[PDB]
Coordinates of C-alpha atoms and ligand atoms in Angstrom, one line a residue:
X1 CA 95.0 71.1 -166.8
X2 CA 92.1 68.6 -166.8
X3 CA 90.0 67.9 -170.0
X4 CA 87.1 65.8 -171.2
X5 CA 87.3 64.2 -174.6
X6 CA 85.0 65.4 -177.4
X7 CA 82.0 63.2 -177.9
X8 CA 83.2 62.2 -181.3
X9 CA 86.5 61.0 -179.9
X10 CA 84.9 58.8 -177.3
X11 CA 82.8 57.2 -180.1
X12 CA 85.9 56.8 -182.2
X13 CA 88.0 55.2 -179.5
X14 CA 85.3 52.6 -178.9
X15 CA 85.0 51.9 -182.6
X16 CA 88.7 51.5 -183.1
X17 CA 89.0 49.2 -180.0
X18 CA 86.1 47.0 -180.9
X19 CA 87.2 46.6 -184.5
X20 CA 90.9 45.8 -184.0
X21 CA 90.5 43.6 -180.9
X22 CA 91.8 40.7 -183.0
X23 CA 94.7 42.6 -184.6
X24 CA 96.2 44.5 -181.7
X25 CA 99.8 44.6 -182.9
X26 CA 98.6 47.2 -185.4
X27 CA 99.0 50.0 -182.8
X28 CA 102.7 49.9 -183.4
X29 CA 102.3 50.3 -187.1
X30 CA 100.1 53.4 -186.5
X31 CA 102.5 55.0 -183.9
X32 CA 105.4 54.5 -186.3
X33 CA 103.3 56.0 -189.2
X34 CA 102.4 59.0 -187.1
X35 CA 106.1 59.4 -186.2
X36 CA 107.1 59.3 -189.8
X37 CA 104.4 62.0 -190.6
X38 CA 105.7 64.2 -187.8
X39 CA 109.3 63.9 -189.1
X40 CA 108.1 64.8 -192.7
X41 CA 106.5 67.9 -191.2
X42 CA 109.7 69.2 -189.6
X43 CA 111.7 68.3 -192.7
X44 CA 109.3 70.4 -194.7
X45 CA 109.6 73.3 -192.2
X46 CA 113.4 73.1 -192.3
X47 CA 113.3 73.9 -196.1
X48 CA 112.0 77.4 -195.3
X49 CA 113.2 77.8 -191.7
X50 CA 117.0 77.5 -191.3
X51 CA 116.7 77.3 -187.5
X52 CA 114.0 74.7 -187.6
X53 CA 116.2 71.9 -186.3
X54 CA 118.1 73.9 -183.7
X55 CA 116.5 72.0 -180.8
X56 CA 117.5 68.5 -182.1
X57 CA 119.5 67.9 -185.2
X58 CA 118.5 64.3 -185.8
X59 CA 115.4 63.0 -187.7
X60 CA 114.7 59.6 -186.1
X61 CA 112.3 57.3 -184.4
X62 CA 113.6 55.5 -181.3
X63 CA 111.8 52.7 -179.5
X64 CA 112.6 51.2 -176.1
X65 CA 111.0 48.7 -173.8
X66 CA 111.2 49.3 -170.0
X67 CA 110.1 45.9 -168.8
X68 CA 110.9 46.7 -165.1
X69 CA 108.5 49.7 -165.2
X70 CA 106.2 47.9 -167.7
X71 CA 106.5 50.7 -170.3
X72 CA 107.0 51.0 -174.0
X73 CA 108.3 54.3 -175.4
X74 CA 108.2 55.5 -179.1
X75 CA 110.1 58.7 -179.6
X76 CA 110.4 60.8 -182.7
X77 CA 112.3 64.0 -183.3
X78 CA 109.5 65.4 -185.4
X79 CA 107.8 68.8 -185.4
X80 CA 106.2 68.1 -181.9
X81 CA 103.2 69.8 -180.5
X82 CA 102.5 72.9 -178.5
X83 CA 100.3 72.7 -175.4
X84 CA 97.3 73.9 -177.4
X85 CA 98.1 71.3 -180.1
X86 CA 98.2 68.4 -177.6
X87 CA 94.7 69.4 -176.5
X88 CA 93.5 69.9 -180.0
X89 CA 95.1 66.9 -181.8
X90 CA 94.4 64.3 -179.1
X91 CA 91.2 65.5 -177.5
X92 CA 89.1 66.6 -180.5
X93 CA 88.5 65.6 -184.1
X94 CA 84.6 64.8 -192.9
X95 CA 84.8 63.0 -189.6
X96 CA 81.1 62.1 -189.6
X97 CA 81.5 60.1 -192.8
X98 CA 84.5 58.2 -191.3
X99 CA 82.5 57.3 -188.2
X100 CA 79.5 56.4 -190.4
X101 CA 81.8 54.2 -192.4
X102 CA 83.5 52.7 -189.3
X103 CA 80.2 51.8 -187.6
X104 CA 78.9 50.6 -191.0
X105 CA 88.6 49.1 -190.4
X106 CA 92.4 48.7 -190.3
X107 CA 93.0 50.5 -193.6
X108 CA 90.4 53.2 -192.8
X109 CA 92.1 54.0 -189.5
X110 CA 95.4 54.7 -191.2
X111 CA 93.8 56.7 -193.9
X112 CA 92.0 59.1 -191.5
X113 CA 95.1 59.3 -189.4
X114 CA 93.4 58.4 -186.1
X115 CA 95.6 55.3 -185.4
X116 CA 96.9 56.9 -182.2
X117 CA 93.8 55.6 -180.3
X118 CA 94.6 52.0 -181.1
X119 CA 97.2 52.3 -178.4
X120 CA 94.4 51.8 -175.9
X121 CA 94.1 48.2 -177.2
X122 CA 97.3 47.4 -175.3
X123 CA 97.6 50.1 -172.8
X124 CA 95.7 51.1 -169.6
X125 CA 97.3 54.5 -169.9
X126 CA 98.8 56.5 -172.7
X127 CA 101.2 59.4 -172.0
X128 CA 102.4 61.9 -174.7
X129 CA 105.4 64.1 -173.9
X130 CA 106.1 66.7 -176.6
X131 CA 108.3 69.7 -177.4
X132 CA 107.5 72.1 -180.3
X133 CA 109.7 75.0 -181.3
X134 CA 107.0 77.5 -180.3
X135 CA 106.4 76.2 -176.8
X136 CA 108.0 74.5 -173.7
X137 CA 107.8 70.8 -173.1
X138 CA 104.4 69.4 -172.0
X139 CA 102.8 66.1 -171.0
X140 CA 99.4 64.8 -172.0
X141 CA 98.1 61.7 -170.1
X142 CA 94.9 59.6 -170.3
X143 CA 93.3 56.4 -169.2
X144 CA 90.7 57.2 -171.9
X145 CA 88.1 58.5 -169.4
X146 CA 89.5 62.0 -169.5
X147 CA 92.9 63.5 -170.1
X148 CA 95.2 66.2 -168.6
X149 CA 98.0 68.3 -169.9
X150 CA 100.7 69.8 -167.7
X151 CA 104.0 71.7 -168.2
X152 CA 106.7 69.1 -168.0
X153 CA 108.6 69.6 -164.7
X154 CA 111.6 68.0 -166.2
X155 CA 112.0 70.9 -168.6
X156 CA 113.0 70.6 -172.2
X157 CA 114.5 67.1 -172.4
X158 CA 113.3 66.1 -175.9
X159 CA 114.9 69.1 -177.7
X160 CA 112.1 68.8 -180.2
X161 CA 109.6 66.0 -180.9
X162 CA 107.3 63.6 -179.2
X163 CA 107.5 60.5 -177.0
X164 CA 104.4 58.2 -176.8
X165 CA 104.7 56.1 -173.6
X166 CA 102.4 53.1 -173.1
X167 CA 101.7 51.6 -169.7
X168 CA 100.9 48.1 -170.9
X169 CA 98.0 46.1 -169.8
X170 CA 98.8 42.9 -167.9
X171 CA 98.0 40.8 -171.0
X172 CA 100.1 42.9 -173.3
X173 CA 103.3 42.0 -171.5
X174 CA 104.7 40.4 -174.7
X175 CA 105.3 43.8 -176.2
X176 CA 108.1 44.4 -173.7
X177 CA 110.2 41.6 -175.2
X178 CA 112.9 42.7 -177.6
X179 CA 112.3 39.9 -180.0
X180 CA 108.6 40.7 -180.3
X181 CA 109.2 44.5 -180.7
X182 CA 112.2 44.2 -183.0
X183 CA 110.2 41.8 -185.1
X184 CA 107.1 44.1 -185.3
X185 CA 109.2 47.3 -185.8
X186 CA 111.1 45.7 -188.7
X187 CA 107.8 44.7 -190.4
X188 CA 106.1 48.2 -190.1
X189 CA 109.2 50.3 -190.7
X190 CA 110.1 48.8 -194.0
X191 CA 108.7 51.6 -196.0
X192 CA 109.4 54.5 -193.6
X193 CA 111.9 57.1 -195.1
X194 CA 113.4 57.7 -191.7
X195 CA 115.8 55.5 -189.6
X196 CA 114.0 53.6 -186.8
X197 CA 116.0 52.2 -183.9
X198 CA 115.2 49.8 -181.0
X199 CA 117.2 50.0 -177.8
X200 CA 118.4 46.4 -177.8
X201 CA 120.9 44.0 -176.2
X202 CA 124.0 42.2 -177.6
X203 CA 125.7 41.9 -172.3
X204 CA 126.1 45.4 -173.7
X205 CA 123.2 47.7 -174.7
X206 CA 122.8 50.1 -177.7
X207 CA 120.5 51.3 -180.5
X208 CA 119.9 48.9 -183.4
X209 CA 118.7 50.1 -186.8
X210 CA 115.6 48.3 -187.9
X211 CA 115.2 49.6 -191.5
Ligands
LIG1 C1 100.9 67.0 -184.8 C2 102.1 66.2 -185.3 C3 102.3 66.0 -186.7 C4 101.2 65.5 -187.6 O1 101.2 65.4 -189.0 C5 101.3 64.2 -188.3 C6 100.5 63.0 -188.1 C7 99.7 62.5 -187.1 C8 99.6 63.0 -185.8 C9 98.8 62.5 -184.8 C10 98.7 63.1 -183.5 O2 97.6 63.3 -183.0 C11 100.0 63.4 -182.6 C12 101.3 62.5 -182.7 C13 101.2 61.2 -182.3 CL1 99.7 60.5 -181.8 C14 102.4 60.3 -182.4 O3 102.2 59.0 -182.1 C15 103.6 60.8 -182.9 C16 103.7 62.2 -183.2 O4 104.9 62.6 -183.6 C17 102.6 63.1 -183.2 C18 102.8 64.5 -183.6 O5 103.7 65.2 -183.1 O6 102.0 64.9 -184.6

């Protein structure tokens, strides 16, 4: 259940963090982009697999702030990841060129698709809960010094998809405020082909479409 990151990933995390230290709000853009890509994947799979969406009929991205618990959640109903894929996609990585280029960054991060790691700019801990059609629900967690993957004792709660949960750093508290999040979500979801919602307040509470 316990794993060490590949050397290349450790180097990558430091590069990403040291480069975007002055543009931290970009992590949200990357998580939303990853979510969109995951949704494109299942949409493609559904063209050839009629039962592809049986675990969850919607294709959405839902974001909610848990201020009390100091958590930010970004959930998509994309293709999801099996246990082996969580370990492979998040723990390992022409990567040498990218790194060479990085060390020698915002646009490059998005192009190589390693924007996930920018979450460490605002979080002391990142948790990834995922359910893929070929596996049971699992949880990946990391403080960046190592990571672990365990079967989710809550069972299959996602249906299908992935939830990125960020335990925000003391100084990243602003990202728990609806205004801030709504504002950022609207900016980075403008060109996403899937509907993105934010659990917001009007005091009654409900999902609010951002794009
Ligand atoms: C493996 C699948 C689909 C991939 O093609 C998509 C693009 C980027 C993937 C990056 C990852 O490492 C996992 C991941 C992250 Cl980090 C995320 O924030 C949201 C997600 O939905 C996925 C995912 O489930 O990704």
